[PDB]
Design a protein around this ligand. Sequence first.
Ligand SMILES: O=c1ccn([C@@H]2O[C@H](COP(=O)(O)OP(=O)(O)OP(=O)(O)O)[C@@H](O)[C@H]2O)c(=O)[nH]1
Ligand SMILES: [Mg+2]
Ligand SMILES: [Mg+2]
Lengths: 50, 251, 1341, 277
Amino acid sequence: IETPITANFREGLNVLQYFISTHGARKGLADTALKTANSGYLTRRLVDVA
Amino acid sequence: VPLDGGRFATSDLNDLYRRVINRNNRLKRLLDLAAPDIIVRNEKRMLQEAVDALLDNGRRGRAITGSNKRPLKSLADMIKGKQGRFRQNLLGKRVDYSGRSVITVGPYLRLHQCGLPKKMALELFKPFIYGKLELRGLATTIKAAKKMVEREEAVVWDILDEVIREHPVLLNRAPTLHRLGIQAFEPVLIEGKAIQLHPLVCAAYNADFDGDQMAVHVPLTLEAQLEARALMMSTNNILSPANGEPIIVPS
Amino acid sequence: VYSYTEKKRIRKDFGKRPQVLDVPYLLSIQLDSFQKFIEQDPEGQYGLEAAFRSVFPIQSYSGNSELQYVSYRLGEPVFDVQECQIRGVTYSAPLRVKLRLVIYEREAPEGTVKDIKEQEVYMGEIPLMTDNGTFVINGTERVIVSQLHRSPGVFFDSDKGKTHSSGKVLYNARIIPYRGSWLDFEFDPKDNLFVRIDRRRKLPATIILRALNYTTEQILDLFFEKVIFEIRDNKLQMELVPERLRGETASFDIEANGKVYVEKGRRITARHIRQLEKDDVKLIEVPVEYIAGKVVAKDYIDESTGELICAANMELSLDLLAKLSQSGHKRIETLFTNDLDHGPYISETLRVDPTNDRLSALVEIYRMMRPGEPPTREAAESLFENLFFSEDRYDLSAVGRMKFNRSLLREEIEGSGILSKDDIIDVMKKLIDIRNGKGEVDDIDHLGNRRIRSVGEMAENQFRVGLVRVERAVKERLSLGDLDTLMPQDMINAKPISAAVKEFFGSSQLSQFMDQNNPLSEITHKRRISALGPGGLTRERAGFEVRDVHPTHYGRVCPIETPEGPNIGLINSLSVYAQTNEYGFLETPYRKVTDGVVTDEIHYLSAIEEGNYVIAQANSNLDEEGHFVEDLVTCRSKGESSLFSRDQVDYMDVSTQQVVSVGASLIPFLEHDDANRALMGANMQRQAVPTLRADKPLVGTGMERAVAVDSGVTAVAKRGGVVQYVDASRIVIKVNEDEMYPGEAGIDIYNLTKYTRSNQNTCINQMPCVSLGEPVERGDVLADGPSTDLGELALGQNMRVAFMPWNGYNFEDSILVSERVVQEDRFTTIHIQELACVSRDTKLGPEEITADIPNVGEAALSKLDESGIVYIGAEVTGGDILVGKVTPKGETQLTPEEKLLRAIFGEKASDVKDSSLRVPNGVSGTVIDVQVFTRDGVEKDKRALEIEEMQLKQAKKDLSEELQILEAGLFSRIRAVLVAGGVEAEKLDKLPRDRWLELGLTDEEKQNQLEQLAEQYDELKHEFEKKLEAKRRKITQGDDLAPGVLKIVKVYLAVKRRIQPGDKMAGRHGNKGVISKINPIEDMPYDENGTPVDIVLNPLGVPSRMNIGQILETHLGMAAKGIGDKINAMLKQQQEVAKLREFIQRAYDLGADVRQKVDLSTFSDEEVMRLAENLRKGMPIATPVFDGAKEAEIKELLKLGDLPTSGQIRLYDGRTGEQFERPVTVGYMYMLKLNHLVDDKMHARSTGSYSLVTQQPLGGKAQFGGQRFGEMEVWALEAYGAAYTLQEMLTVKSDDVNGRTKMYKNIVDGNHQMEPGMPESFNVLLKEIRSLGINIELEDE
Amino acid sequence: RVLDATQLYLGEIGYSPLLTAEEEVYFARRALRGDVASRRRMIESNLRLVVKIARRYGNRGLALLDLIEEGNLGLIRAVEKFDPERGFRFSTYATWWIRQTIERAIMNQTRTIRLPIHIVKELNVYLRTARELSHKLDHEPSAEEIAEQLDKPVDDVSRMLRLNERITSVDTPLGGDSEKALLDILADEKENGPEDTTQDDDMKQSIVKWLFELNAKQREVLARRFGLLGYEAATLEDVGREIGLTRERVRQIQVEGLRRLREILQTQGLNIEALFL
DNA sequence: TCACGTATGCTATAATGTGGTCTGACGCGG
DNA sequence: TCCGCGTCAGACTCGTAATTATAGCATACGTGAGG
RNA sequence: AGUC
Ligand SMILES: O=c1ccn([C@@H]2O[C@H](COP(=O)(O)OP(=O)(O)OP(=O)(O)O)[C@@H](O)[C@H]2O)c(=O)[nH]1
Ligand SMILES: [Mg+2]
Ligand SMILES: [Mg+2]
C-alpha cells in the first residue's frame, strides 16, 4: 500500500488507518488456512520420495 | 443395517449392483424374446453404463446421482481418494488406549514428566489394573474388577498408582510436523481434568496453553515401553534432528 | 434528560463526537425481508403475490381448461412457539389459496361461459419468523443467514494473461439474468468475437445477430463507421474526416486543394488536424494502391448484368476497384478500421462465421445446445426465442434491468425482463469499446456488484419452484380429465410445495442452528452475510481476491469480523448503520455538507453513489454549529483518501462507529489493538457463557445497552406506567392514561421465561429488573435476560488483574486465578441438558416404560416413581436411571454358562431386556422438569397421567388469574369513568362487582366507554372458555409422533459447573488462556491495603500480541473501581447527600472535551442514593470505538480515585510477605468464560465398540472414540526407531480383531506381548480390488 | 460428439417409420399370424409412444432410459395381445400396457428393501386419502385420522406408513462438509468389545477350575445337563441317558451342585456383587 | 386341499423424437 | 493449441436426522399344515 | 457452525 500507517498502537489508529490495516491482517490469516495446504503437500511429497 | 429408528441404511454399492443386475437380466429377457436390434443395443449401452458406474463412477462422463443429488460412491472411490482406504484406514488409523484433553502448564514437573488426570489414566490402564487386581487376589474375576473400578474404590487408586510407575505415555499434538511432535513422558497422576505439560518441550510441540489439546497414547508391550523410554523420551530428544541445535531451550 | 432505568445507573461517556443518528434496530434485516415475503401487496410483486402472478394463470395444453389465482391467506399458527419447541414441530401457518377453475368451449371460439369453479385449497404450511428473527423448525430455533451474490445485469471482465503465454488480455462480457441461460461474449487471441450461450461451445458472435435477422451490410453499418470513396475522372478521391487519421502515420503525400499538408511518412500531429479541419477539407486525392485492403460495406452489383461484383464485407483490390468503376459506380462505401481505436473485429468475425442467412444461424445455435437432433425451422425459432426472449424462462428482474441499463449508460432504469435485440448489440458495442481502449472493466468484488438476498427473496424462490412442480401436474390433469365433474383441489398437490419449502428451511446450508451462547452471539448471527450456499461461491471456488477487504466495505461490511477458518472472507458481519437499499445493495448513512456547512440532513448512499462524492472523515473537526474548523479536511473519494479544501467536501461519515460491526463495537480500546487480535476478540465474545451472576462491564463502549435491548432477550416495556405486581415469574404493569387505550383493559402482563434450555445447553433465565410500584416509561427494561445487567449487555465478569509472572503458572497465556473467584461463584455456569427416552414398537412387540426392570438395584429404583420416571428435584449422577424402559427379546438361545447363571439366581425376569435412559457418564445434575408425549391409542402410564393432572390444574390456574386480574383492572377503569359524571364512591364499592351489568349513567361519551368495557368483559368471559378448551385438548392430545414410536419422555437436567484448570478464558482483545492453577487466597499477590488480586496474567503475552487495548482497559478499569471504592467508603459512612452529589458531579464532568453533560442537581435525593448504591461496585465508563478515552483522561480519572497515574502499584507476595522488586500493573479487566470447558473436552478410552466395515475403533467422544493416529503421527514413529509402537498402533490397537482381544487377555495376564496379525482394513482393501476385477493374491514364503 | 446413451437411442427412434390406421391393421394381421418384420416394424414405429409416456412420469423413481426400456417391454406384450379385428385403435390399447409395465417396475426396483404390490396398492390409497385430508385440514394427516377415513385398523395404517420409510445412505457424509460418513458413527453391534469377550473367557476358564473343585458326581450331572462339558444341553429327565438313569436323584444332585457353588461365589466375593449382573 | 403373501393379467376414444448448474488452479500429457 | 486429469496439510467438536407415486380387481404360482 |  502506497500510504503507510504513521501512527502506532499506543497512539491509537484512526478509522482510516485501522481499515487500511485490515487488508494485511486478513491476508495473513487466510494465508494460514489456505497455504498450510501447499506447505503440507510438499512435506507429504518429500516423505513419500524418501 | 437397521438404524435404531427402525429405518435401514445401506452402502451405495447396493444401488449400483442393483442397477447392473436389473439391466443384465432385462438383457437376458430381450434376448429370449428375440427383440429388434435397436432395443437390444440400447440395453447393451445401458448395461455397460451400469458396470462402468459400479467400477468407477464419474470417469465415464456424468456420474449417476443417488438420493440427495450426490454421485453414488463406487468401488474405485473407496480405494482411490485420500479418503479412500489407503490414507484413511491403513497409512493411519484410529487407535485404542488413546485419549485427549486441554493442556496446561506443569512448571513443577521435571523434563521427563507430565501431569495425567486421574480419571483419564484410570480408563487408559484398565487391563493393567484388572491384571494386578487378580494377582493381589483383591479381585476374584474380571467382572468384579470392572465393578470395583466403576465404584472407583480407594484401593483401586493405590493399584493404579502402582501400575503407572515407570510406565511411559506418548503425548502428541496436531499438527505432527517433525518427530518431536510425539514425545514420551513418565506420567504423574493429578486430580483434575487437564494434562500438564513441561514448559521446555512446549517449543517442540509448538504448544501454547490458550486451549490447545493433546493426544495421549499408552505403549502396551515391553518392546513399545522400551522404545518410548529409550528413543522417544523427552530427555533423550533434546537436539533438533533438523539442525544440530537444542530444541529443549528455556523461553 | 435521562430515562428511569438510566437514573439508576449512568455510564460515564468519554466520547466527544455528538451522535446525529442513533443506532437503528439491529435485527432490521431479517424482519423487513421476511415481512415483505408474507406481506399482502395487491400491486408490489413481493413474495407470494409475485409468485402466484408469475406462474398463474396456468392454462391447459388443449386450451379448454385454465386455473387462475385469486388470493391467499395464512391460517393462524396451530401451535405457538412454546408448544412447537417442546413437541418438536415447525412453527408455521397453513397457506390457503383461492383458485378459480375456468373452462372454455372447443366448439365456440373462446367462450368462457361454461364452468367457473372457485374454491380455497391448502398448499403447505409456511414456517413463520419469530419477532426475534428466528424460525422454529422441528422444535429447534434456527437462523436463515442473508446471502451475498452477483447482482444480475452485465459484467465486463478480462483474463489478465492467464491463457496464451502470448500474454494477450482477452476481454469478455457476461450477461447475468436473475432467471435464465447466461449470455457470454468473448474475444479470441486473433481478435474474433465469440458467443457462448449457457457457457457451452464457442460460436462466432455474428451468428447471434443473423439469428436476430441481421443482414451482413446491416451488421457492418451497426459496428463500423463508413468511409466514402469517390472515383472522379481518373484520380481516386475519398471523403475525409479531419480527425480520423489522428495519431496515424501518413502513408501517402496528403494534398488538399493544390497544397501539401502532410509529408509522406510522417506522423500527423494536432496542428495538421486543426489546419485541415479549419480549411474545411472534404475531398482528398489518393493513390489507387491505398484501397488494396479496405473493406467494402454494401453489396455492389453490375446494373447491366445484375450479378454481384463484390459481396459485403469483402477485401477490395485494384482489379475489383477497376471492375466497379467500369460498371458505373463512382462511390464506394468502405469500413473505417484503423487498428488502435477502431478495430475491425466484427469484420473478421463475419469471415470466420460459417453461416449465411438467419435460418442457417438459428440451426447452428440449435445444433450447439441440442447436438445430433435434426433441425426443424419451428424448433430452431422456438428454442432461440425461449432462451432469452421468453417472459417465462428469462427474467433479469428490476435489479438486473436497472444495473444493465446503468452499465450501458441509459437514462431509463425500469424496463423489460427479456433481452431486446438492441440490448445485445449495445453490450457487444461496449465490449468492443473496452477492447479499443475507451471504457473500462467492471470489478466483481465491488459491493456495487454484490447484492444482498435476506430471507424473503429466498423463501419466494423456493416457493416458485414448488408452484412450477405443481404447474406440470395441474396442466397435465386439466388436459386428460373431463372438465365438469373435476374440481381444482383434486388436481393440486400440497406435498410438492410443502417439500420445496421444508427443504429450504430445514435442509438448506443457509438455515443453521442459531448460535445462542449469549445475546451478542444471537444478534450477530442474525446479521450475518454469507457468500456461500446455493447460487453462491464454494470454498473450492473462492479465491483470495473475494476474501480480502474491499474499499466499498467502508460503512457496509465489517473489515474486522470474519471466521478464522476456511470461511475466512466469505462470511461477513454487517456494519452497524448499514442497511439494504430497495434493490438489495448495501448502503450507509452520510451527513450532507451544503455550502461547507454540515447539515443534519442524512443520506443513505449505495456503493456506486459513494464513489461519486467526496466524503469527509467522521473525526474531521466541525466548528460549533456550522462548517469545518480546519481548512484542508481529510476526506475520501474515488476509493482513496487525502486532504481536500472545504468547498470540495460534499458529505461526511455519520458516526465513528459506522465502519465497524456490532461485535467489534463492544471492544473498548479497539483503536489500540492489532486488527487480527481484535477479530478473535469479537469472535470470542460470541463464545462467552453467561455466568450465574450477570456482571456489567466496568469498561464499556455504549453499544452495551443497544445490544441488550435490540436482542429481544430482555423484556422491554411497551406501554410503561406503574408496576402493579412483581414476581419471580411475571411482571404486571398498570398503564398510564396517556398511552392507555380506552377500548381494552389497560394492564400489560409480561410473563418471564424461567430457567430454560439453550441450543448450546446453556441457561436462559429472565429476572425482574424493577421493584414493586416503580414508574416506568416506554422502552424501559422490565426484566434482564441471561447475560444482561440493568439494561446493559453483560457477557462476563470484571476482575482485579495483575500483569506479572508467577512460578510458570502463567507460562504461555496460562492463567493463574484466585480461589476467591470460585468461592464467589463468579464464572460458575448453568447448563440445562435435554434427554429423551423413546418407547418404540418393534417386530417383537412394544417396549414398556415400567419401573419393573430386570437386574436393577433398589438404590436405582428408589429414584423412579410408580410409572418409572425420576421425581422432579431429584439429584442424579452418571449411570442412575432417569426413565426405565425394557424391550421385548425373542427366545434367547443362551450359552450354557448363562443357562447355569439364570438357573442360580432364578431371576429369569421374563422375555425382556433393559434399554433404560440413564444419565450420561460423568455428567451430574438435578432433574428440573419432565415432559411426556404419548400417542393416542396406547394406555397412558400412571406417571404420564399425574403429569397431565398437574398441567391441567396449572393451566386452569393460569387462565383463571388472567381473567381475574383482567376483570379487576377493567372494573377499576369503569369505577373511574362512573365517578367522572356520577359521584358514587362508597356506594359503588358496597354492592357486588358481579352485579355491575345494570350500572350506567346518562347518554354521553362516558356511556359509550361503559359499553366498550362491558363488551370486553364478556368477550374475555367466552375467550377464557375457548382458551381453556384448547389447553385441555393439547394436554389430552396423543401427539402424532414418528411411526414406530408409542411415547416419549423428555427429562431436563440442570448442571452447575465450577471454574477449574483446563477451562478456557479470554478478554475482549482476543487474549485467550487456559487456567493452569487455582491459588489459595493467602498465596496471591496483595496490595498495601491487603486486598489480593483475582487473576495473574503474563506480561509477555501483550507486546508480542500487539493488543494494547487490554492494558488501557486495565488502567481505566482500576480508575473506574477507584471511584467506586470512594463511593463505597462514603456510603458506608452515610455522610451527606450534598457531599456525594458534589463528588459525583465533579466525576461525571471530568473529561477534557466530554460530549456527555450530566447536570446532576435535577436528580432527587432518592434517585441519587439508588445511583450511588449502583456506582459503588465501580463507576461504569464508556469508551466509544475510535472516539475513546485518552491516556491523559484516564490518568486524570486515576487522580480522582487517589490511585497512581502509572496504574502500577506496589504488590507483596502472599507466600513470602516480601515486596516484588518493581511496581506491577493492576486494574480491572472484564473477563469471559468461553464455552470450551475441559469437562466437555476431556476424553479417554481403553477399549470400546469398533467400526462396521473397517473394524477400526470409532471417532469422537460421543461415540467413545479412539484418537486418530494419522499419517503425520505415523511418520514420527518412522523417524524415531519405534517399530513396535507403530505396529501396535496399526494392528492390535485398531483393526487386527484377533490380535486386540488376544493382547487384552495377555495384558490382564500381565504378559505384555503383542502377537500381531493382519489389519481387517487390509482384508477389505483386497476384496475391494478383487471387486474391480483385479486379481490381488498374496504370494506365500 | 454425440456420446450420451439417451440422445443416441432417441436419434435411432426418430429415424423410424410412423404407422397409419390401415398400415397398423395390415401389419397387425401379419404380426399375430407370426410375421418377423411385421412385429419388428410395429414395435419400432410405436417406440415414440413409449417415450412420450416414460418422459411423462419422470422424476418419480427410475431414470428416463430405465423407464423407457421397461415401457418397451409393455409395447411387446401390447403387440402380442393386440386385436386388429376390433375397430378401436392400437395407440389406445398400447398406452394401458406401457403404463402397466412402467408402474409395476417402478413399484419393485425403486425400493432397496423390495415391497409387494399388495402393500404398495394399500399405501397408494392411504396417501391419496392423506392428500384430501391435507386440503381441508390445514395440518397434515395423522395415522389415526387416515384410519378413521378408510374405516381400517390404526395398527395396519401405522405398519404401512412405516414401510414407506425410505432408506438413508450410510456412505453419505453428514456434517454439512464431507467430515464423517454415517458408517463411522455406527458401530458393529453383533461384535462384542474385547472387554466383554475377555469377561466370557474369564467365566469359561473359571468354570473349568470350578468343575475340579466340587464333588466328582456333582459336576458330572450339572455340566452334562447344561451342556457345559458334555456335547448337548439335556434336561433333568434326559440326564438318565448317561449313567444317572434317575429323575429324582438327578434333580436333588443338580441343585446340590448349585447350592455348594452359590457359597463358592459368596466367599470369592460375587453372589449379590454379581447379581446386578 | 386351503391359507396367505406374491405375481401375472387385462382395461380397446385417441394418444407415436428428451428438456438441472451455470466461475479454481497450476502442471503435464496426447 | 486445447481438452483431460491430477494434485491441493493434519487431527479434533457439535448437530440434527426427508420426498414422490405408481388403478383396481381376477386368476395364477408356491409352501405348510391339517384332515 | 466451530477449535489447534
Ligand atoms: O489453523 C490453525 C491454527 C493453529 N494450528 C496449530 O496450533 C498452534 C497454535 O495456534 P495459535 O493460533 O495459538 O498460534 P501460535 O501459538 O503459533 O501463535 P500465537 O498467536 O498464540 O502467538 C499453531 O502453531 C499450529 O501448530 C494449526 O494447526 N492450525
Ligand atoms: Mg497460540
Ligand atoms: Mg494455540
